[PDB]
A paper describes a structure:
We describe here covalently linked dengue envelope dimers that can be produced in the absence of prM and which also reduce exposure of the immunodominant FLE aiming to suppress the generation of unwanted yet ADE promoting antibody responses. The X-ray structures of both anti-EDE1 and anti-EDE2 mAbs bound to DENV2 sE showed that they bind at the E dimer interface, at a site where the fusion loop—which is present at the tip of domain II—interacts with domains I and III from the opposite E subunit in the dimer. We used a structure-based approach to identify pairs of residues at the dimer interface located such that their replacement by cysteine could potentially lead to formation of inter-subunit disulfide bonds and improve sE-dimer stability. We obtained crystals of both sE A259C and sE L107C/A313C in complex with Fab EDE2 A11 belonging to the orthorhombic space group P21212.
Production of these four cysteine mutants (two single and two double mutants) in Drosophila S2 cells showed that the best yields in disulfide linked sE dimers resulted from the A259C construct followed by the double mutant L107C/A313C, suggesting that the chain can adjust the geometry in these two cases, but not in the other two mutants. The double mutant L107C/A313C also eluted as a dimer and the peak overlapped with that of A259C, as expected. The crystals diffracted anisotropically to 3.9 Å along the h and l axis and to only 7.2 Å (A259C) or 6.2 Å (L107C/A313C) along the long k axis. Refinement of the atomic models of the mutants was done at 3.9 Å resolution avoiding over-fitting the data as much as possible by keeping very tight geometric constraints. The results are consistent with the introduction of the disulfide bonds in both sE dimer mutants not inducing a gross rearrangement of the global conformation of the sE dimers, as illustrated in the superpositions displayed in Supplementary Fig. 5, with a root mean square deviation of 1.11 Å for the A259C mutant and 0.14 Å for the L107C-A313C mutant over 775 superposed Cα atoms. To verify that EDE epitopes are effectively exposed in our mutant sE dimers, we tested binding to both anti-EDE1 and anti-EDE2 mAbs in a direct ELISA assay with plate bound recombinant wild type sE protein in comparison to covalently linked sE dimers performed at low E concentration (10 μg ml−1). Both A259C and L107C/A313C mutants were efficiently recognized by anti-EDE1 and anti-EDE2 antibodies, in contrast to the wild type protein and in line with the crystal structures, showing that the mutant recombinant sE proteins form stable dimers correctly exposing the EDE. Of note, we found that the single disulfide bonded A259C sE dimer was fully competent to bind the panel of anti-FLE mAbs, whereas binding was largely lost when using the double disulfide bonded L107C/A313C sE dimer. On the other hand, sE dimer L107C/A313C, containing disulfide bonds at each end of the dimer, is locked and unable to expose the FLE.
Residue numbers in the entry:
A (entry chain I), E (entry chain H): 1 to 52, 52A, 53 to 82, 82A, 82B, 82C, 83 to 100, 100A, ...
B (entry chain M), F (entry chain L): 1 to 9, 11 to 27, 27A, 27B, 27C, 28 to 95, 95A, 96 to 210
C (entry chain B): 1 to 16, 20 to 226, 228 to 392
D (entry chain A): 1 to 15, 19 to 394
C-alpha cells in the first residue's frame, strides 16, 4: 500500500557520525512533510526533526543543538538524517515518519504555518543506532547469595548481546527468571538470572548457574551458596 | 516551550472504558487542539490513533474516542480488549516549529488480579569487591500490572547517578519482573551506613535496605 | 658585505658626510677615505599604529535559513532570529487559500531569515606617516668568512627609524658610531588616504571613495558579528507570491581588484609593507674608524679557500685563509699590472684584516679592465693570481 | 479549479475557439457556453538540447605549487609540470651568489608552476527555440471535493508542447478532448543569444560579447576538461626585485560578472529548467469538449453547507456543499438572484455543478454581483438561501 | 642552545584529521628549511615533508598523495603538519627536524635548487600519533602449555598500554621474561610472558600467571599446565 | 625515483672497524655525494652523523668517518666501543625535490659471547580455538647479539600476512629476547599440515615446526 524503509543504523563510537536514510513508496513523497522520531530501548517516543517539501524549513528538537541535519531527495523518494557528535543519550531506534494529514490542508507541503494541523500517520519499522565503545568480551559472573529464598547470578560487562543462562546444566528450570540486559553508560551490557527455591533446600542442594556468551565463545559456571 | 505529562500506568478490566490524560505545562488551548495520540504495542511501530485533538482516522476502531479542553487532552477507550494492552503516547507542539511527545502511559488490560511486587536487594559480592567494583542488584518480581517505579537512596539521600533499570518483562506465570542496578566503587559503597531500593507499584511503596556492615 | 650578489646595488663615495637612497631590494655600499666600507639595506617597513576605519565583506555565506508563514488575517509571522543581529530577515506576502492550507483566500504574511557569515573581507587601515617604522641593516665590510651576503644580519647592526625620529646614531662593534639623518620620500602622502588591505595585496585609496563602497561593513570599533548593510550582498526574491528565497550576490573580490586599477598598489605581508617609496638618508662617518689600523702586516703565506668570482658589477670576491703566524694581523693586498709597475684596481673591503688563522677573510675589490694581477700577502708564498 | 487562490489569474471567455496567454505564476480560467470551465497553468519550461558554447572560470584556485631554480651559467631550469596542461608555469631570473647558494654571482633562472583548479564556473548555452519544452497542467472545474487549488495535479492532465509541435489534443477524462495550437512570444529571440548560466541565476546575452569575455574558458567540445585556456587571465606572476617568484590568483569575478550583467535579460534558473519571463500564446478549440452529463436530472433533496463561503482575490466566491438527499448522480440547481428573487444576477464559474457521490461534497465557484445578493443552492424544501455582500 | 618541541600527537580515528605543531626557539628560524620525518614503532625512519623559508616550496613523500599539508609561521617560530584521511599505515612518531647545513650555503633558506646539500642536524623528541579503533579493552589471556621447559601466557587484544604480568602472585621471578607488546592491524596490543623452569617440576609445581590491565580495571589469573 | 637499501645487521667486536653500506637503485653519483648518515640509539632521537657524503659535523667523534663511490656510500667506525650499539640510517634525495631514508642497519657491539637463540613455538591454545581464533607464538630467547630475523611458513610456503614481531629486548641476564606472532583463523590453522617459525641469527637458521594434528 504505503511503506517507509529506514537504513543506516548500527554501532557508532562516542563523538562519531552516522547517516540514516529512509526510502518512501506508495505516496506523493514530494508533497509531504517528513519527520524523524526516536525511541530509546524500552523507553518512550522522542520527536527529533521535521522537513517540509522544499527543504526551506527544517526544525529540530532542543537536544540536537545543531548536531543533526535533516535533508531529502524528492526525485529519489529519500529522507536523510546526518548525525555528528553522538553521545550515549542518543542510543535509540530511529523511525522515519510521514505527516499525511498536513497534506490534506496544504497539498504543496511547503508553508511552515505556526502550529499547523499535523498527524504522523505512516511510520517505518525503525533502524537501531547504538552509540557505544566495546566489541567482544566474555562476562564477569558474580553470585547473588541467598539471604522460600531467591538466589541468582549477576553477569556484568559483556558485549554484544545475547547471553544465555541455565541452572544446574538445565536440571533446574522451575522458578528461573533470566532478566533482560541493561546497557550501561560504559557501553557494556549486564543482566541477572534468579531462581526462587525452598529456603529449606539452601543447605543441601548445590546451585550452579551456567552462563554462555557465544559472541565471545565464553562459558562460566558459578556456584551460588549462602 | 511546553512539556506533556501522562500517567505512568492505567489498569482496566475487559469491557470497561478507560481514559488516559495528557497535561501540559506552559501550554494553552492550541496545544490540546492539536494533540495527537499514538498506540505502540510491544515490539511494534507506533500507530496514529487520534489527530487534531479529537478526530479519528479511518481504520482505527470506533472504540477509540478523544476529548480535549483548554487545560488537558484525553483519550477514551470504550470496551477495553486484551489487544488494547500497549503503551500510549500523546504529542503536540512544543513551540511554533517543534513537536514534543508525552512520557507515555502503559495501559494494562486486567486478565488476572493485581499483584504487588516482591523485592529482593543484593549487596555487592565479595568477588566483585575484589575486582574493585560494586553493584547493588534490586530484584522485583511477581507484580501486576507491569509498571513499577524505582528510587535508590544512599542513607536517606536519593541517588540517581549510576542507576540503570530494565523495562518490566513477563514471567513464566504471566506476571511481570524487573531489575534495577546501582553501580558503585567499593569506597562509595563503604562510605555510607546503608543503601535502599524503593519500588512503587499502584501507589504503594516497598523499600528494602542493606548495609555495608 | 650583505650587498654582494644583489643586482640593484649602488657604490656611493663621500669626500672626507654622504647622502644615500634606500628602498626595498636596493643596497648601498658606502666608502670613504680611512673609513670602513659599509653596506646598507632596507630590510623592512612597518606601519605600527594603524586605526582600522572599516572592514568590508567581499565574500559572504548564508546559512541556517528559517522561514515562517501565516494565513490571511492571522497577523504577521515572527521568528526569534529577527532579534539575532547575525541574521538577515525579510517579510513578504504570499497567495494563500484552500489549496494552500488556509481556510480563506488572501495574502498571508511570510518571513525568511538567514545567518550572514563573511568568508572573505577587506580592511581599511588609516596609517599616520610618522608611525611608519623602517628597519635598516648596516653590515660593515668586515671580511668574516661567512659575512658575505648573509641575510641573517647576525653581523649587521639593525636600526629602526621613523619619518620623525630621523636622526639615529648606530654603534658598530669595532668601528665606532655612524650618524644617520633620514627623510621619507614616499609616492603619496598618508593624509586623506586609506590603506585598503585585503589579502596579500594592498593599495592606497581616497577616503570618501572608501566610505562610499556599497558592501557590508563592520566599524573599527567592532572588529564582531553584527554586519551593517547586509542588504548590499543579500537579495530576497518572491516573484510569484508563492515562496520567498534568499540569495547571495557573489564574491566582489575581482570586482574590487578591477576598481583598484587606477590606485597606487602596495605589496603586503601580514601587517608589513614592501613600499615603493625611497628613504633619503644622510650619513656621517666622523666617528667611524677602521678597526685595527695600528696592526702590522702579515708575514706568513695565505691560502685560497674559494674560487674567485665576478659580481654583476665587475667587482671580485676572494676568500683566503692565513696559514702563517701573527694573527690578529693585516693582510697585504695589491692589484697591479702584469709587470708589477703600478697599482691599478681599487679596494672595496678596505683594510682587510685577519682575526683568527682558522677563519678565512673575504676581500672584495674592483679590478681594472683587462689583464690584472691579484697579489695577496708578501713573499715568500705571496699569492699571484691572474685576472681578465 | 487549480487557479483558485492565485492572484495572477485571468478569466477568458470565448465569444468556440479562444486565444489564451500562459506564463509562469499565471493561471488562465477559460469558459464557453455549454463547455466545461478549464484551468490552465504553465508548470515548467525546459531547454532540452542546449549546446554548451564555452565554459568560463569565474573563481579559480592555485594548488600544487612547485618551484625550481638554477645557479648562474647552469642553464634554464625545467619541471615536468611545464608539460602538464593543468599547470601554469613561468620562467624568470633571480639574483644569485655566495650568500644565496651559488659558487658564483649572477642571474640564476627560476621557474614556478602551479595547478589551476576552478572553484566556480559559468556556462554559456546555445538553445534552439524549437527545443523549449513547456509543461501545461489542465485542471477541469469538476467541483470535486479536493479539486480546489490542489497542486498535486492528480486532477489536471499534464501536457508537454514545443514551439514547433504547437498543436496537441489533450483528453480530459469525462469531458472529451481540447485542441491547443500554441506559439512562443519570448522577450528575446534565441538567435544570437546565449543563455549565460552561472549558478541558480541565468541571463540572455549577445554571442560576440560572451565570446569576448577575458576569463579562462573550456570549449564546448572539452566538457569535464582540464586544459583551461587563457589561464593567464586569472593568474599573475610577481618577481619585482628579482629575489623570489610568487604566483597570485586574481580573485572571484562572480560579482563583477553580475554587475556586468545588469543591462541583460535575466532568466530564473533551476538545474536545467527555466522559469521564463516570456509568454505562450495558445489557441484552444473546445468543439470536442463536452459538459459531462448534459442529460441529467436535478437533485431533489436538500444541501448542507460543509464549509464557510470564502471570497477570492478577484471577487468570485467558492461554496463547498454536501448533498444529503437521494438521486446521485444528479445535477445541482444553482442561482444567484436579487434580494427579491426576481432575476438571476451573478454568473457561474463552475458551470454545470453535478453531484457524483452523496458523501463527497462539491465545490462551486461563481461571480456574485456587486452589493447584496442571494445564493440559492438546491430546490424547495430546504433550498439554501445565503445572503452575500460585495463592496 | 637550540631545541624543537613537537605537539599535537595522540589518538585519531581512521579517516580522521590531526594537526601537528612544532615550536622552534634559539636560532634564526625564518632562514632555515624544516622537515617532518616519521618512524613507525620499532621500525625505521621515513622522510615525510619539507618547507622552505617562504613556504613557496613544500614537498611531500609519495605515500602522502595530498593528505598532509606542511606550513609555517615564522614570526611565531612554529611549524605545522595538517593531516587528513589517516590510516593505520600512518601510526608513528613524528619528528620536527631542521636542515642546519643548507643554512650554511643559502642563508635565506628560500631557493629550492635541485639536489642541494642538506643535513638534518636538529631533531625534536617526537610526538606520538596513534591511528586506531578501540577505546578501552581488557585482554583475553590464553595459556602456552609446556611441551628445562618454557611455559607462558599470551595476552591478546587489549588497549591501551600497559599490561603487567606476574607469576604465582610474584613468587616466581627467576627465569620470568615479560615481552614488549606488539600492535596488531586491529589496533589492539598483544604480549606474552614466559618462564623457564626445570622440566622435573612440570608435574608437581603449579604455575599461575597474574595479568593486570589497570586502564580497563581487569585482572585475570590463568593456570598453565602441560 | 631512487631507493636506498642497507644491510639488516652488522656485528663487530670492541676495538674493531666496521663498515655499513648504503646502496641505491635508480641512483647516480649525485645521490651518494649527498648521502647523510644518522645514528639512533634505542629509545632516543636520531643524531646527524655524516652529511654531504663524507663531512663530519663538530661534536661527532673522530672515530666516525665516511666514504662514497659511484655505486654506494659507506660509513666506517674505527675502534668499536659498547657505547655505539645503535641503528644507523642513510639518507639522500629520491627526486630533485624529495628525500628518502634507507631501511636501517642494526649494529651490534659484541660485549659478551655470541649466543645462538633458543626457539620455542607454541600452537594456538584450545581456549583460543574455542574463541574462533588462532595465534602461533614464536618465542626467541637467550641470544646475543640482539639481532634476529624471523620467517614464517605454512607447510613449505613462506607466509607474511598476519605476522607481527617485536624488537628484541634485553633480558635480566643482558642477552636478548624477541617474540613473533602468526595470526590465523581456526580454519586456516587446520587447513595446512604444519607451520614453521624460522629464526636467523649471525648467518645461521633455526626452524621449529608444529602441526595441527
Ligand atoms: C489534494 O488532493 C489529494 C488527492 O486528490 C485525490 O483526488 C480525488 C479525485 C480522489 O482520487 C481522492 O483519492 C483524492 O482526494 C487529497 O488527498 C487525499 O485526502 C484524503 C483525506 O481527505 C486522504 O485520506 C482519506 O481519508 C481518511 C481520513 O478519514 C478521516 O476523515 C474522513 C473525512 O476526510 C472521515 O470520513 C473519516 O471518518 C476519518 O475521520 C484517511 O485515513 C485515508 O487514508 C489512509 O487510509 C488507510 C488507513 O489505513 C490507508 O490504507 C491509506 O493508504 C491512507 O493511509 C483516506 O484515503 C486520501 O488518502 C488522499 N489521497 C491521496 C491520493 O493522497 C488532498 O487532501 C487534497 N488537498 C487539498 C488541499 O486539496
Ligand atoms: C651565515 O651566517 C651564519 C651565522 O653567522 C654567525 O654569526 C657570528 C656572530 C658568529 O656566531 C659566527 O659563528 C657566524 O659567522 C652562519 O652559520 C654558522 O655556520 C657554521 C658552519 O660554518 C655553523 O656550524 C659550526 O660548524 C660545525 C661544523 O663543523 C665542521 O666543519 C668545520 C668547518 O666549517 C670543521 O672545522 C669541523 O671539524 C667540522 O668538520 C657545526 O657542527 C657546529 O654547529 C653545531 O655544533 C654542535 C653540534 O652538536 C651544536 O652544539 C651547535 O648548536 C650546532 O648545532 C658549529 O656551530 C654555525 O653553527 C652557524 N652559526 C649559527 C649561529 O647558526 C652561516 O654559515 C652563514 N652562511 C652564509 C652563506 O653566509
Ligand atoms: C546552524 O547553526 C548551528 C550553530 O552554529 C551550526 O552548528 C549548524 O551547522 C548550522 N546549520 C548548518 C546547516 O550549517
Amino acid at each position: 500500500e504505503v511503506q517507509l524503509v529506514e537504513s543506516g543504523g548500527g554501532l557508532v563510537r562516542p563523538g562519531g557520525s552516522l547517516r540514516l536514510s529512509c526510502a518512501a513508496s506508495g505516496f506523493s513523497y514530494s508533497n509531504h512533510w517528513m519527520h524523524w522520531v526516536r525511541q530509546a530501548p524500552g523507553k518512550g517516543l522522542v520527536w527529533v526533526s521535521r522537513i517540509n517539501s522544499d527543504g526551506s524549513t527544517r526544525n529540530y528538537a532542543d537536544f540536537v543543538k545543531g548536531r543533526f541535519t535533516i535533508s531529502r531527495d524528492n526525485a529519489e523518494n529519500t529522507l536523510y538524517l546526518e548525525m555528528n557528535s553522538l553521545t550515549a543519550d542518543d542510543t535509540a531506534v530511529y523511525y522515519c515518519v510521514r505527516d499525511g494529514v498536513r497534506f490534506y490542508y496544504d497539498s504543496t507541503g511547503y508553508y511552515p504555518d505556526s502550529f499547523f494541523k499535523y498527524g504522523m500517520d505512516v511510520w517505518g519499522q525503525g533502524t537501531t543506532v547504538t552509540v557505544s565503545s566495546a566489541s567482544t568480551k566474555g562476562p564477569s559472573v558474580f553470585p547473588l547469595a541467598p539471604s522460600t529464598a531467591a538466589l541468582g547470578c549477576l553477569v556484568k560487562d559483556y558485549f554484544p548481546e545475547p547471553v544465555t543462562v541455565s541452572w544446574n546444566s538445565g536440571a533446574l528450570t522451575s522458578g528461573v527468571h533470566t532478566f533482560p540486559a541493561v546497557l550501561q553508560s560504559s557501553g557494556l551490557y549486564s543482566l541477572s538470572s534468579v531462581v526462587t527455591v525452598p529456603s529449606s533446600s539452601l543447605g543441601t542442594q548445590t546451585y550452579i548457574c551456567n552462563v554462555n556468551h557465544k559472541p565471545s565463545n565464553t562459558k562460566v559456571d558459578k556456584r551460588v551458596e549462602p | 516551550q511546553s512539556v506533556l505529562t501522562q500517567p505512568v500506568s492505567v489498569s482496566g478490566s475487559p469491557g470497561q472504558s478507560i481514559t488516559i490524560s495528557c497535561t501540559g505545562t506552559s501550554s494553552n488551548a492550541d496545544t490540546y487542539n492539536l494533540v495527537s495520540w499514538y498506540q505502540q504495542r510491544p515490539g511494534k511501530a507506533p500507530k496514529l490513533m487520534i489527530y487534531e485533538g479529537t478526530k479519528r482516522p479511518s481504520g482505527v476502531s470506533n472504540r477509540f474516542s478523544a476529548s480535549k479542553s483548554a487545560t488537558a487532552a484525553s483519550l477514551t477507550i470504550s470496551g477495553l480488549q486484551p489487544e488494547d494492552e500497549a503503551d500510549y503516547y500523546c504529542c503536540s507542539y512544543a513551540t511554533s516549529r517543534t513537536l514534543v511527545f508525552g512520557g507515555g502511559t502503559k495501559l494494562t488490560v486486567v486478565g488476572q488480579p493485581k499483584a504487588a511486587p516482591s523485592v529482593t536487594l543484593f549487596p555487592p559480592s565479595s568477588e566483585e569487591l575484589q575486582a574493585n567494583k560494586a553493584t547493588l542488584v534490586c530484584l522485583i518480581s511477581d507484580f501486576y500490572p507491569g509498571a513499577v517505579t524505582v528510587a535508590w537512596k544512599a542513607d536517606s539521600s536519593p541517588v540517581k547517578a549510576g542507576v540503570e533499570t530494565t523495562t518490566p518483562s513477563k514471567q513464566s506465570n504471566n506476571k511481570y519482573a524487573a531489575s534495577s542496578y546501582l553501580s558503585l566503587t567499593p569506597e562509595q559503597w563503604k562510605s555510607h551506613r546503608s543503601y535502599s531500593c524503593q519500588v512503587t507499584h499502584e501507589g504503594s511503596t516497598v523499600e528494602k535496605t542493606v548495609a555495608p556492615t | 658585505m650583505r650587498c654582494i650578489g644583489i643586482s640593484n646595488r649602488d657604490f656611493v663615495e663621500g669626500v672626507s658626510w654622504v647622502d644615500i637612497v634606500l628602498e626595498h631590494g636596493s643596497c648601498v655600499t658606502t666608502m670613504a677615505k680611512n673609513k670602513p666600507t659599509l653596506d646598507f639595506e632596507l630590510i623592512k617597513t612597518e606601519a605600527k599604529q594603524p586605526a582600522t576605519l572599516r572592514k568590508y565583506c567581499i565574500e559572504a555565506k548564508l546559512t541556517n535559513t528559517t522561514t515562517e508563514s501565516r494565513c490571511p488575517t492571522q497577523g504577521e509571522p515572527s521568528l526569534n532570529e529577527e532579534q539575532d543581529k547575525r541574521f538577515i530577515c525579510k517579510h513578504s506576502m504570499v497567495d494563500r487559500g484552500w489549496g494552500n492550507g488556509c481556510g480563506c483566500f488572501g495574502k498571508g504574511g511570510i518571513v525568511t531569515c538567514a545567518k550572514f557569515t563573511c568568508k572573505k573581507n577587506m580592511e581599511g587601515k588609516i596609517v599616520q606617516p610618522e608611525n611608519l617604522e623602517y628597519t635598516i641593516v648596516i653590515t660593515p665590510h668586515s671580511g668574516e668568512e661567512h659575512a658575505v651576503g648573509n641575510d641573517t644580519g647576525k653581523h649587521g647592526k639593525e636600526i629602526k627609524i621613523t619619518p620623525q625620529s630621523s636622526t639615529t646614531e648606530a654603534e658598530l662593534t669595532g668601528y665606532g658610531t655612524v650618524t644617520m639623518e633620514c627623510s621619507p620620500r614616499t609616492g603619496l602622502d598618508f593624509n586623506e588616504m586609506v590603506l585598503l588591505q585585503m589579502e596579500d595585496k594592498a593599495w592606497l585609496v581616497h577616503r570618501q571613495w572608501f566610505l562610499d563602497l556599497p558592501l557590508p561593513w563592520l566599524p573599527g570599533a567592532d572588529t564582531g558579528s553584527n554586519w551593517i548593510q547586509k542588504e548590499t550582498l543579500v537579495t530576497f526574491k518572491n516573484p510569484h507570491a508563492k515562496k520567498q528565497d534568499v540569495v547571495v550576490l557573489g564574491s566582489q573580490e575581482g570586482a574590487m581588484h578591477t576598481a583598484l586599477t587606477g590606485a597606487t598598489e602596495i605589496q603586503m605581508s601580514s601587517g608589513n609593507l614592501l613600499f615603493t617609496g625611497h628613504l633619503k638618508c644622510r650619513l656621517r662617518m666622523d666617528k667611524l674608524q677602521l678597526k685595527g689600523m695600528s696592526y702590522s702586516m702579515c708575514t706568513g703565506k695565505f691560502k685560497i679557500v674559494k674560487e674567485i668570482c665576478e659580481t654583476q658589477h665587475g667587482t671580485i670576491v676572494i676568500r683566503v685563509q692565513y696559514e702563517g703566524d701573527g694573527s690578529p694581523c693585516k693582510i697585504p693586498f695589491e692589484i697591479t699590472d702584469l709587470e708589477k709597475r703600478h697599482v691599478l684596481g681599487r679596494l672595496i673591503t678596505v683594510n682587510p684584516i685577519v682575526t683568527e688563522k682558522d677563519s678565512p677573510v673575504n676581500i672584495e675589490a674592483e679590478p681594472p679592465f683587462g689583464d690584472s694581477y691579484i697579489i695577496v700577502g708578501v713573499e715568500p708564498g705571496q699569492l699571484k693570481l691572474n685576472w681578465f
